[PDB]
Structure 1
Amino acid sequence: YEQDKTYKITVLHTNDHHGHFWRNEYGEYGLAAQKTLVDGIRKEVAAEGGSVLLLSGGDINTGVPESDLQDAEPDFRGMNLVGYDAMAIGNHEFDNPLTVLRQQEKWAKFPLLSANIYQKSTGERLFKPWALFKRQDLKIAVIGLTTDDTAKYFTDIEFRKPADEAKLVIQELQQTEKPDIIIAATHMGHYDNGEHGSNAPGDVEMARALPAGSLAMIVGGHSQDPVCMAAENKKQVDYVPGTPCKPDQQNGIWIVQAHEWGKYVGRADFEFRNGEMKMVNYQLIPVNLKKKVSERVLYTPEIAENQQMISLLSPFQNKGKAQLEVKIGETNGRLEGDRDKVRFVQTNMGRLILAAQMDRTGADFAVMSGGGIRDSIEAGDISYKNVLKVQPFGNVVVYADMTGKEVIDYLTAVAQMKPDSGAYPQFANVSFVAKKIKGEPVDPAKTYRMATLNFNATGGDGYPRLDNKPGYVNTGFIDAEVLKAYIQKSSPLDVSVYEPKGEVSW
């Protein structure tokens, strides 16, 4: 670089896209709007003679039926048109057989990075560990790292420790390419003050374990939080879009994350001079997010939807929408989901839905509030559209490993919820008489696994929070997808097997 010259670099980032290539019901986010936003910033920055780099923290896969049924093809084609430079591989790119990932790699015009995923047999990396970008005189290197919790398709696949692979890699780069700047795009998660709990160490411990400022910044994901600091080592709890956002910085390394689903495009403006990399500004830019006030009003000026992007994706949206009509299985009887009934008594729909949740998570028992079941499935053929009417809100399946004592306190709390309300609890593998888990009595000093929905897990309908506790894991699998997979796996269905035989009572 020319000695003593100020080079301007803007880094744009998103993460945990999860199938959201199209705007939602309320016309929020979607890739067509994101493209107008990004072209806008490029136009701007180019006029000032600066550089732009657009990075992704991973998890493009899994999250919306129309995307899932098409192996996220519209999402990667959309990203190509938005112009992504690189992407870190996320844990959800492994929801499909590796051949599908290799295929998404053929569709992606930009590289998919991950330095820590090895093939056991050979002992070699399966993907490119980094990518080099030349912007003006600067040589910028982007390293990719993937959470080693992903193993939760992994035959002959090893996820080595991110923080340690990062060190090796940072060395190979400096001896080899000698970059002026090094950025890590990672899919590991941000945990306040490194308190990752039962999860694998994330961005904060990595930054604290690496040598001081050996990385300009870490563009993250996985935890899916907009990383805005309220205090030192504390993210704000309910970040409000459109308001100031202060990135975290540990051991001289900036750590950022843009939440999830294309909801925000993060923007970090830096000035590089004589080797000093300086962040002169940061902001989390909302993509047509609206607040419910009732009405839903935009937090910021509306961003128009790029028409070329709309032209590209509209075929995929119609195709995926049509493919919901396809039959996924059959049932020999009515699955009872009428609200006049799922908010008063236990029904077979409740049992089926929770049967599918425990199946995906390996849970010992499960619970959810009755108001979450939105419709019934009459006897006969079942389509994906039929399940989406039952589970239309896209809540996520989570689970919590807890002790006998804890399950007793939780259920006792939940057994309090009253009928004739949406907070009324549907149980599975639990039997009682108010005034045993899976038949056997509850060993107090035993660890049991409970599955439920993120909604109730965080307090929804007033249930006890599991949210902030050790052993809690959000799987990122969507309610309707988990039901749909269980159903086709279990067809033809026999509602007999799901009839509640009076096991819990008051």
Structure 2
Amino acid sequence: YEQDKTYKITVLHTNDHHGHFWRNEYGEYGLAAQKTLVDGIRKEVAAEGGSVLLLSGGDINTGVPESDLQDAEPDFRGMNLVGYDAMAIGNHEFDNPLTVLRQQEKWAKFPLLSANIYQKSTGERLFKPWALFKRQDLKIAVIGLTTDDTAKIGNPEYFTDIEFRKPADEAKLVIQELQQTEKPDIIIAATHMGHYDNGEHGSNAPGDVEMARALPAGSLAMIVGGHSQDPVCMAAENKKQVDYVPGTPCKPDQQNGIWIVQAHEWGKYVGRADFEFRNGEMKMVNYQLIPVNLKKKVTWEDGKSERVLYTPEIAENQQMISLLSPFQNKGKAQLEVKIGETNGRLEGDRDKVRFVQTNMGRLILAAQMDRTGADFAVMSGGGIRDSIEAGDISYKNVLKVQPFGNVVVYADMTGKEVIDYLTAVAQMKPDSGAYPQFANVSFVAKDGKLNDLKIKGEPVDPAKTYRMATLNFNATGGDGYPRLDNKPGYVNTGFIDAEVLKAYIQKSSPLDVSVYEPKGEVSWQ
């Protein structure tokens, strides 16, 4: 590099896009506005003589029906237009078969990176570990890392010959290899690992903070993250702000001389890190999370309430709107048609379905039992991703509640097995994707044991055979559920979760939420 020359480098980042290529119902975010925002930063930076690098923390897949149904083609094509330089592979890029992910690499004009994912039978990486970029005369390496919780919380069928090695260890190896073979001036890691205050990851796989502390001091200028879906803005040393407010200052975390950033989720913000490089020294000189047309509510005495922008409106790029509209409207009529109605709200909120039994759990499981002739059922609360408001119901609503394309399966088992299976599942704790939603099951759990266990009001008979329904995801060991696929009596029906729920709603409509209300059949103490 030129001695004593100060270089200006701006790193833009987003993460956990989750199918949000289009603006929402209140005109927030979307890639059209993102494109306008980024184009503008590039003009400003070019005029001040600097460089720009735009990175994604991954998890582009899953979260919006229009995107989900099209394997996120609109999202990757949209990201090509915004101009992403690289992306870390997130766990949700494995929600589909590898062929789909490979197709996404074809679509993406930017590399999808991950240094720690290997094919077990060959001991070789399935993706590129890093990418090198040239800005002015500097060499910048971007390494990609994916949480090793991926096979632990994803669909087991896709990982039979794939292994996620510990990210922090992989990073140590890669940084060493880069410093000895490539000698980049700056090294950045795009990761899908999660930011946990003070490295307190708990039951989750270790994330960015623990990695930064384990790496050589300042060996990375920055870690651009994701997965935990947080705007990483520090309120105090080692404490992220709770309820961060758009448009306010955001101090990224810094651990062992390495900055850690994250832009929450869904294109809500474009994070902007302004650095200045001089004689090997990387100084972050400014940082901010730029809201993408986010809004707040204000209330008039009139009783009227309306949504107001936090910052000046960002215009939607027309070229992007033209590129995305065809995807946005594909099959629009069908997705929106009425399939039934509900006299009450069906609770699918994360702070409910992963903590207590909800009528949405009861409803989904009822559809599954109905289709399979099962006696009882269970599924992970993490498998419920939205609610259904009182009123009419469209297929689009169903696709929001169950977006993974899991398949309904069933298993005939003995009472002894029912008791052991349910005892193990009853051990999954609240505040976890693994927390179980049960149907036709009742018991009182104390000291890792089930008291009063009943299936449909009747005590379990060890000798009798029962049939339970669930998703292939849980049956194959997903979320750490006891495997059932390696037991006799298991059957994969091939029926798509969403299609089963839709068909059930249709014939059962109008729905009386009273019939699906949890009455404490299952308890814990």
**Quick check: TM above 0.5?**
yes
Once the two structures are TM-superposed, the CA of residue 297 in structure 1 deviates from its matched residue by 0.9
Percent identity at matched positions?
A: 100
- Looking at structure 2, the residues matched to 220 and 420 of structure 1 have their Cα atoms a distance apart, in angstroms, of 22
Once the two structures are TM-superposed, the CA of residue 418 in structure 1 deviates from its matched residue by 25
Once the two structures are TM-superposed, the CA of residue 139 in structure 1 deviates from its matched residue by 0.1
CA contact (8 A) 2:62 2:404 kept: no
Once the two structures are TM-superposed, the CA of residue 73 in structure 1 deviates from its matched residue by 0.2
- Looking at structure 2, the residues matched to 477 and 90 of structure 1 have their Cα atoms a distance apart, in angstroms, of 27
Q: Deviations over 1:2-53 (max 9, x none)?
A: 0110000000000000000000000100000000000000000000110000
CA contact (8 A) 1:198 1:471 kept: no
CA contact (8 A) 2:115 2:145 kept: yes
Once the two structures are TM-superposed, the CA of residue 321 in structure 1 deviates from its matched residue by 2.4
CA contact (8 A) 1:62 1:477 kept: no
Which residue is 1:223 aligned to? 228
CA contact (8 A) 1:433 1:505 kept: yes
Q: Deviations over 1:216-269 (max 9, x none)?
A: 000000000000000000000010000000000000000000000000000000
Once the two structures are TM-superposed, the CA of residue 385 in structure 1 deviates from its matched residue by 3.8
Once the two structures are TM-superposed, the CA of residue 175 in structure 1 deviates from its matched residue by 1.2
Once the two structures are TM-superposed, the CA of residue 174 in structure 1 deviates from its matched residue by 1.0
- Looking at structure 2, the residues matched to 63 and 162 of structure 1 have their Cα atoms a distance apart, in angstroms, of 25
- Looking at structure 2, the residues matched to 154 and 163 of structure 1 have their Cα atoms a distance apart, in angstroms, of 21
Unaligned runs of 5+ in 2: 153-157, 299-304, 446-453
Once the two structures are TM-superposed, the CA of residue 56 in structure 1 deviates from its matched residue by 0.2
Identify if the C-alpha distance between structure 1 residues 25 and 375 changes in structure 2 by more than 3 Å, giving closer, same or farther.
closer
Identify if the C-alpha distance between structure 1 residues 433 and 93 changes in structure 2 by more than 3 Å, giving closer, same or farther.
closer
| Secondary structure, counterpart of 2:460 in structure 1 | coil
| Secondary structure, counterpart of 1:255 in structure 2 | strand
Identify if the C-alpha distance between structure 1 residues 398 and 215 changes in structure 2 by more than 3 Å, giving closer, same or farther.
farther
Q: Deviations over 1:171-200 (max 9, x none)?
A: 111111100000000000000000000000
| Secondary structure, counterpart of 1:166 in structure 2 | helix
Identify if the C-alpha distance between structure 1 residues 295 and 204 changes in structure 2 by more than 3 Å, giving closer, same or farther.
same
CA contact (8 A) 1:324 1:384 kept: yes
CA contact (8 A) 1:197 1:470 kept: no
Once the two structures are TM-superposed, the CA of residue 431 in structure 1 deviates from its matched residue by 3.9
- Looking at structure 2, the residues matched to 129 and 444 of structure 1 have their Cα atoms a distance apart, in angstroms, of 52
CA contact (8 A) 1:198 1:470 kept: no
- Looking at structure 2, the residues matched to 107 and 83 of structure 1 have their Cα atoms a distance apart, in angstroms, of 13
- Looking at structure 1, the residues matched to 110 and 345 of structure 2 have their Cα atoms a distance apart, in angstroms, of 48
Identify if the C-alpha distance between structure 1 residues 283 and 399 changes in structure 2 by more than 3 Å, giving closer, same or farther.
farther
Q: Which moved more, 1:357-366 or 1:448-457?
A: 448-457
Identify if the C-alpha distance between structure 1 residues 390 and 219 changes in structure 2 by more than 3 Å, giving closer, same or farther.
closer
Q: Map 1:160-175; keep pairs closer than 5 Å.
A: 160-175=165-180
Once the two structures are TM-superposed, the CA of residue 63 in structure 1 deviates from its matched residue by 0.2
Identify if the C-alpha distance between structure 1 residues 406 and 288 changes in structure 2 by more than 3 Å, giving closer, same or farther.
farther
Q: Which moved more, 1:96-105 or 1:398-407?
A: 398-407
CA contact (8 A) 1:63 1:477 kept: no
- Looking at structure 1, the residues matched to 73 and 106 of structure 2 have their Cα atoms a distance apart, in angstroms, of 11
CA contact (8 A) 2:62 2:403 kept: no
Identify if the C-alpha distance between structure 1 residues 258 and 345 changes in structure 2 by more than 3 Å, giving closer, same or farther.
closer
Once the two structures are TM-superposed, the CA of residue 324 in structure 1 deviates from its matched residue by 2.0
- Looking at structure 2, the residues matched to 309 and 207 of structure 1 have their Cα atoms a distance apart, in angstroms, of 37
Unaligned runs of 5+ in 1: none
CA contact (8 A) 1:70 1:320 kept: no
Q: Which moved more, 1:176-185 or 1:368-377?
A: 368-377
- Looking at structure 1, the residues matched to 319 and 84 of structure 2 have their Cα atoms a distance apart, in angstroms, of 16
Q: Which moved more, 1:184-193 or 1:291-300?
A: 291-300
Identify if the C-alpha distance between structure 1 residues 261 and 342 changes in structure 2 by more than 3 Å, giving closer, same or farther.
closer
- Looking at structure 2, the residues matched to 447 and 9 of structure 1 have their Cα atoms a distance apart, in angstroms, of 66
| Secondary structure, counterpart of 2:54 in structure 1 | strand
| Secondary structure, counterpart of 1:456 in structure 2 | helix
Which residue is 2:449 aligned to? none
Identify if the C-alpha distance between structure 1 residues 74 and 487 changes in structure 2 by more than 3 Å, giving closer, same or farther.
farther
TM-score, normalised via structure 1 length: 0.74
Identify if the C-alpha distance between structure 1 residues 150 and 422 changes in structure 2 by more than 3 Å, giving closer, same or farther.
closer
Which residue is 1:124 aligned to? 124
Once the two structures are TM-superposed, the CA of residue 292 in structure 1 deviates from its matched residue by 1.8
Q: How many positions carry a matched residue from both structures?
A: 505
- Looking at structure 2, the residues matched to 475 and 285 of structure 1 have their Cα atoms a distance apart, in angstroms, of 46
- Looking at structure 2, the residues matched to 138 and 473 of structure 1 have their Cα atoms a distance apart, in angstroms, of 57
CA contact (8 A) 1:24 1:30 kept: yes
